[PDB]
Design a protein around this ligand. Sequence first.
Ligand SMILES: O=P(O)(O)/C=C/CCSc1cc(F)ccc1O
Ligand SMILES: O=P(O)(O)/C=C/CCSc1cc(F)ccc1O
Ligand SMILES: *Cc1c(COP(=O)(O)O)cnc(C)c1O
Ligand SMILES: *Cc1c(COP(=O)(O)O)cnc(C)c1O
Ligand code: NA
Ligand code: NA
Lengths: 387, 387, 264, 264
Amino acid sequence: TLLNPYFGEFGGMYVPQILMPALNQLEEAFVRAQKDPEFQAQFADLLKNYAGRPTALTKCQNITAGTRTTLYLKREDLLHGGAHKTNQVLGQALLAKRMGKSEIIAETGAGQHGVASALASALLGLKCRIYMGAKDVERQSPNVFRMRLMGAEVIPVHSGSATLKDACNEALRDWSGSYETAHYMLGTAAGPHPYPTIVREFQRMIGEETKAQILDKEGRLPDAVIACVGGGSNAIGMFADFINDTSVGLIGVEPGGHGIETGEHGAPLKHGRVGIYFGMKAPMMQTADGQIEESYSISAGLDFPSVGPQHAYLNSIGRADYVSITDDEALEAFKTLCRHEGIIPALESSHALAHALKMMREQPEKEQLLVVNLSGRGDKDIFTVHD
Amino acid sequence: TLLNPYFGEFGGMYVPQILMPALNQLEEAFVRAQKDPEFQAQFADLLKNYAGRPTALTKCQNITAGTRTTLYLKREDLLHGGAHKTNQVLGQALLAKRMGKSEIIAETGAGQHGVASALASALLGLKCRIYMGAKDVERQSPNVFRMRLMGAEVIPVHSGSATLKDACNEALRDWSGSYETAHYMLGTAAGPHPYPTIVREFQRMIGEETKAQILDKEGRLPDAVIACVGGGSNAIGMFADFINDTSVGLIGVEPGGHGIETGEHGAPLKHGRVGIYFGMKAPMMQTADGQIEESYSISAGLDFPSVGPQHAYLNSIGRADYVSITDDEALEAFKTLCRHEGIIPALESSHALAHALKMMREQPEKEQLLVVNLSGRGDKDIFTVHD
Amino acid sequence: ERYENLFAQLNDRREGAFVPFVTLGDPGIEQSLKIIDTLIDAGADALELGVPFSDPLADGPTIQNANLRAFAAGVTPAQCFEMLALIREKHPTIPIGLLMYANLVFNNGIDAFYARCEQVGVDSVLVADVPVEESAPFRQAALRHNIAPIFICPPNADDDLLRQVASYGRGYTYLLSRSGVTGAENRGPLHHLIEKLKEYHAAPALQGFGISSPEQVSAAVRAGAAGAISGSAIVKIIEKNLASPKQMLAELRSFVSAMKAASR
Amino acid sequence: ERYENLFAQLNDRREGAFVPFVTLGDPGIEQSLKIIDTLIDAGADALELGVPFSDPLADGPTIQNANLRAFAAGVTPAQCFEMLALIREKHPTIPIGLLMYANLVFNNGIDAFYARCEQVGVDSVLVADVPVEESAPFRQAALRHNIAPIFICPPNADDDLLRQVASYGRGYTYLLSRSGVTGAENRGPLHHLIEKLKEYHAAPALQGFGISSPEQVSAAVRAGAAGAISGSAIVKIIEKNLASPKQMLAELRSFVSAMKAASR
Ligand SMILES: O=P(O)(O)/C=C/CCSc1cc(F)ccc1O
Ligand SMILES: O=P(O)(O)/C=C/CCSc1cc(F)ccc1O
Ligand SMILES: *Cc1c(COP(=O)(O)O)cnc(C)c1O
Ligand SMILES: *Cc1c(COP(=O)(O)O)cnc(C)c1O
Ligand code: NA
Ligand code: NA
């Protein structure tokens, strides 16, 4: 391959032989795109004039009153679509187009990636096919209608546990037979190479913008940048530009569900076991017999039962640290931001905020410059948090 | 007064004697604020770093294919909160603060102004009181929960028709007794002076940004700028900077409901009668006996039964032109933008888009540079458009 | 000059004026006509009559409901003028003031509304939502048809306002005892205003808002005001006895006799 | 060397190999054991056995349901190895290949899984989600425990792949007749590959995917392939007759006899 498929022991290309030429094709189109100033200029224009780039960096004064912490939030919730997921799908769509592809295959759990894939395809003139577990379809009627209204075909998968896992399966099944006309738009920084590398690169703007932004407003790099970890895309996007800045701490937050000790959580990188699945070698929600299991969380969007290979790797060498936050903990942070800052955060992002809040509260006299990545909007979670 | 309360024959200050000193106070604080570089710098910082200013200007290529029209959309749907309403409430909140006020009184129909007033108060540390007709409260549970979650007090008004009209009444009743500690945050460019002038001025950024933006991208001013008219705030904000540019057409769109001819509409400026109500002289939804009536529309947010005085005036001298769009017409434009551009527009804004679409379709060979003000997001209308 | 005559008369009796308020058509036309005669018979010196309006932004719940009850009966503004004529054809000297909101008088011409008031025998008109700054056209029209334009003097009026009110008003000066809206639900020192108004030769002052007890009217008189207006306390008796009309009139009598006695 | 012996034997008979597939434990353990003996008795030359996995991303609905039915019966991977041992203790010469997914063999050590295969009498192992680029550890472990590592040759393999497959594989070369996933639901010219594989001294090729009729196996043999594999067509007969076990076995017999006859 032209690039390294592994991040230490993690990563790889574990797909049937039939899909290997599809992956080599994609990789090569990416290396070229990345060198093409015309691709770069087009990607840039779409981000600025269509998505709302650059997003703001907001100082939270009320929330940190009476402590020595200075908290700022990356305004990814202000991006068109309500989440960070939008940056990514635009680039991938431009890649599909570059390859001569006219069809898009998508995977979605909570619905967010589905909506983002659907909007990118409508804008760029691509036919979108989306796989959703029958359970999730029933559970997420609003996003399903949004998807269809945007011209996308929604297909319920009733196999297995009828959720994200099974949606991921049906998509590869489809792709193994249509790779010549269709391009698979993977939704996170995981899966077989070159997806983990491509998703990071197309999500890099985040930390890049945050750097200049904090440098302007404070004339210093932050002490730490925090982000939730479902599959790893928003987290790695924040991290990337700061990896070579050794003084900046990188903290990822995984869903703790009802509590790690109950086994009812979604924290594989820290409380799971390394396995091989979804074209990848990485930590996973697994039974003792190696049967792939489900991840649980109050937020539907942190359901991916595995995690990005670059995260497992940054953890092993000690570059980044990972922690977890329970359902009740994420609810508290949701409530607090609404009340003191007037911002309604996604229950996903709330996990990241909750940790920043703990960092403060636990050591209020500690001088600290923190940046939380507010990866999305919480209008979606009003009824959930209400019942 | 320091400024003119009238726009020709329209406008005024028709409130009980007891509220007159409150209005003179507000006016004077506004004249001062407007001269204060420190107020200006604070207002600017809040718009940029908290609200997401400047918003994008998006070219809609797919939608205008095969015609000679070039359409661009002002991305007000990308503002924090999902609507233009946010710019306004921040300024008014800073004004209340400047006056030594610590309490906010608010009026809301569909819920948008309620949410915007609630968020501004949470950020700026003000106690918010909100009046909502019992009918609207029941009809808008999501916004009511959003409001409360943001620390605001929601109060159902059961008097009269229990809708916007009656909410507007209870607020003035309250204000007539609390003006010494509380400030009334009016939600549109209407009501007694100085509200129509203040709301415009705090909504001016829109057209100001649009000018520079179109000048950069096309090196020419637009042929026409279009905007929906519920009460008039988003429309006037777009218009303002272009008023002295005689070659630029200004078009306002009023809800036609089931059709003007059925009497089931919300177009007073063009199909109502001049009356005196809500501290103002202006066109109004009225019975033959002068009893104030209700405005109807598929979009709940275009319910205000009257209209801003500056609009009635711009219409009389021929500077601006006003038209209407029916329910079915607004639904079509909603569907079309989702499908061809991947943007979900509020049913409010859809009325403006629908007219721009007619302008094109009716005369496809006409060269035209158009700008529609996309005043808000349509996630809110998914279920409505679905049933 | 109905007000002028009444006041000179009351002064010759070293007496204050007791003015009750009701909404025309509440709980019904016929019953309303009956309530009004009972009011006068029990001692009312003058009358303040509100015509049903959809958005009374200067009124509390009690009076808000009076408008609603009238609407439920189907009372229209045209039906109101018919009622007014009959009341005058029955009572020739009693001053009659109308409580109005802006749209109802501007609706089909400001001039024509005042002309209709003259033709019916109305004495004064207070438009609750028109401040002095906006009264010119209403003032002029009223004067032209021999109708007295009533101006409101708030408890916080500065010299400039006092001088304006004194100069433009006629019939009586509406001395607002409180801030807020109408309502006997909550009570309400006007000596300073009363003296200054007298100094600028203003029309005699009638204190209104929150007056609901005998002691309250005696106090108004002692302060120097020529009388007092009471609405919620009156309308509340109507609300209370809707199922027993006879009970209404009987209780309506006792209250206004007590209130009248307090102005002596 | 079970495969080597079988193929040399079949060649001496100028015959092709007919290899049926089933999921271990579908519809139940006991019934599965019964289906397998019926398969062999009716003429099967070798066997391809899949152990129940939660996410079979290379399988169509038919086989997806076989895994689900097995799961419903409570068949575990440990229970699978117990089944395999009994099958060998009963049939000593028949080649047995396992259809596997990556996690099940890596789960508790790659080495230990292959050691268990040896101890049970398994002959080959195909890991559906491990391409040549990632096979090193699986290849090495298999060879170390005398298990043949099965490599897949897609219909679009370039020279570099053909050479790699020929060099690393053993037992048999899995010639994919189609693109997509398993399923007799839709049918599928491999002459070029077959010749090149023979040129590079690859293990004998078995054509798999979409083979569901007698004519299909005769065609595979005519092309130059040493035999054919059929799964969906077999599993479909099990699905059809779940309520009548006896009916299942009887119909299972007729199909594989017909298919076997076609390789002569
Ligand atoms: O109910 P209360 O407090 O006794 C007051 C009676 C009603 C007097 S008439 C009036 C005057 C205004 F300036 C505004 C509204 C009105 O209804
Ligand atoms: O159903 P069909 O088309 O007849 C195919 C039968 C199953 C052969 S064994 C196998 C091999 C693979 F490469 C992937 C999945 C599998 O189950
Ligand atoms: C889509 C989604 C996620 C899950 O994220 P990964 O970055 O890929 O882990 C997180 N937050 C929000 C708001 C999301 O919509
Ligand atoms: C609040 C609201 C309106 C009504 O608007 P005015 O500008 O004051 O007429 C229009 N559009 C949207 C999206 C709104 O939320
Ligand atoms: Na995960
Ligand atoms: Na309107």
